[PDB]
């Protein structure tokens, strides 16, 4: 089976540059190679075919380029509806093999997130467990730190985090941190709090609630 | 399969349109 | 031309696994058309399950070729897909896929490229049951404002197996909304939370119920997330 390989296997960008994708094969494939589009929401979809060959639809933007082992798309004014991961295929050998993608996502300016905290519902006390929600919205870039801390003391392995792609228009992430516990843990301790820091945060946020008033 | 054998037919139609 | 692929959510191991894929747009004895399946795993790897045609004549990817049939139904128009002996490494998005294909004196004989995708369509292929899900309201307070706008949310926790989907006021909220990706919990069960911010002033005016449905056990849930006052 003919080996494919893409890099990078990600990139980020401002709306208007150029980027350029490159992809290598293990044999010549001679230019038997198609480009695809991958978005959450839709179903895939082509571009490029045949290293060269634009479909009907698709932005001119994209253009591809290549031979022997080794070709190349590239996206020439990138427009917020090109974020996306891009996949290339050969089609020279009988057992047709994809590249790994890659994925484009924006450069964008610092936001702050907001943060929010949600302590659990009676309803779900009454199942006999307790999650706590941490909810940090609309901020850049993608990396944060979020400590959890009950009367003062750090959780270990108590959470877990999760992180949603990054917003079309927005351009930004949002994430949940959820710390989850036994009604007998909970009901032990008073002062619940969530600790967040973040590049364009100058000081550490803090939300904290204490357990019933 | 047959697939594959369009690659070589691709050449042999070459050979053909040269003619 | 549209491309609906449909089966089970679920598939137990050392089973056979048949999803069947209606096609929309012409017929599949077309024959300026192959039909073909391909699937992503977990991972982001896409993997060519096969290749068919009008006629008959059927292409299998080797490391398949021993368990896979793939077939048309030409009387209802669909395109079918059994893979039996099925283990965990199955577990995948299953896409349903068009390709042309172009004849001798074509400007464009022998390139061969999927121009047509559907939507895919999830398979996991596990030991474990079924389980839905219970949703637990992530309730407005002064906890969950800043500023002019409030967050509220619901919280879908212990069920398997993947995928839920989840709405707001029945589609009709679709402004702010995050519903994030599942996680993994140590019991084996997954459990995500979905959350919408709208301005504070709406609140006490503006109902806000979630939706959530998970297909493999048939779960449709509505909860409804009301003020507290905090
Ligand atoms: C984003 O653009 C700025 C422009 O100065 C650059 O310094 C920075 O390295 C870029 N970051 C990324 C992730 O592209
Ligand atoms: C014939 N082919 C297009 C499949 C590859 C070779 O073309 P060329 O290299 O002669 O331009």
């Known amino acids: 089976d003919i080996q494919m390989t893409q890099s990078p296997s990600s990139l980020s960008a401002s709306v208007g540059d150029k980027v350029t994708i490159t992809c290598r094969a293990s044999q010549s494939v001679t230019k038997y190679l198609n480009w695809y589009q991958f978005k959450t929401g839709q179903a895939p979809r082509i571009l490029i075919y045949g290293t060269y060959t634009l479909l009907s639809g698709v932005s001119p933007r994209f253009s591809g380029a290549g031979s022997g082992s080794l070709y190349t798309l590239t996206i020439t004014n990138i427009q917020p509806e090109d974020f996306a991961t891009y996949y290339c295929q050969q089609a020279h050998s009988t057992p047709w093999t994809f590249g790994q993608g890659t994925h484009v996502a924006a450069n964008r300016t610092v936001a702050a997130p907001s943060v929010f905290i949600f302590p659990p519902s009676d309803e779900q006390l009454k199942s006999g467990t307790a999650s706590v929600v941490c909810l940090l919205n609309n901020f850049y870039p993608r990396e944060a730190k979020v400590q959890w801390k009950v009367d003062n003391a750090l959780q270990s392995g108590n959470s877990q985090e999760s992180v949603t792609e990054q917003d079309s228009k927005d351009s930004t992430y949002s994430l949940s941190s959820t710390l989850t516990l036994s009604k007998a843990d909970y009901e032990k301790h008073k002062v619940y709090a969530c600790e967040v820091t973040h590049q364009g945060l100058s000081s550490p946020v803090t939300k904290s609630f204490n357990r019933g008033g | 399969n047959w697939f594959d054998i369009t690659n070589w037919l691709w050449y042999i139609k070459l050979f053909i349109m040269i003619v | 031309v549209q491309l609906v692929e449909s089966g089970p959510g679920l598939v137990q191991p050392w089973g056979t696994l048949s999803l069947t894929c209606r096609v929309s747009?012409?017929?599949?004895?077309?024959?300026?058309?192959?039909w073909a399946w391909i699937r992503q795993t977990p991972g982001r790897e896409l993997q060519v399950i096969g290749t068919?045609?009008?006629?008959?004549?059927?292409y299998y990817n080797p490391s398949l070729r021993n368990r896979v049939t793939i077939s048309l139904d030409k009387s209802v128009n669909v395109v079918s897909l059994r893979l039996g002996s099925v283990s965990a490494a199955d577990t995948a998005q299953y896409y349903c896929?068009?390709?042309?294909?172009?004849?001798?004196?074509?400007?464009?004989?022998?390139?061969?490229?999927?121009?047509?995708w559907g939507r895919g369509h999830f398979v996991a292929v596990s030991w474990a049951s079924t389980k839905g899900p219970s949703v637990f309201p992530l309730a407005p307070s002064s906890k969950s404002t800043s500023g002019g706008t409030a967050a509220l949310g619901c919280l879908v926790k212990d069920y398997f197996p993947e995928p839920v989907t989840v709405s707001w006021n029945s589609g009709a909220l679709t402004s702010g909304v995050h519903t994030f990706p599942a996680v993994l919990q140590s019991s084996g069960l997954y459990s995500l939370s979905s959350v919408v911010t709208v301005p504070s002033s709406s609140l006490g005016t503006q109902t806000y119920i979630c939706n959530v449905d998970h297909k493999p056990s048939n779960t449709k849930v509505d909860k409804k997330v009301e003020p507290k006052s905090c």
């Open positions: 068919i045609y009008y006629s008959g004549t059927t």
């Open positions: 896929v068009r390709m042309p294909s172009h004849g001798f004196w074509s400007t464009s004989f022998s390139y061969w490229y999927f121009d047509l």
């Open positions: 747009g012409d017929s599949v004895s077309n024959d300026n058309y192959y």
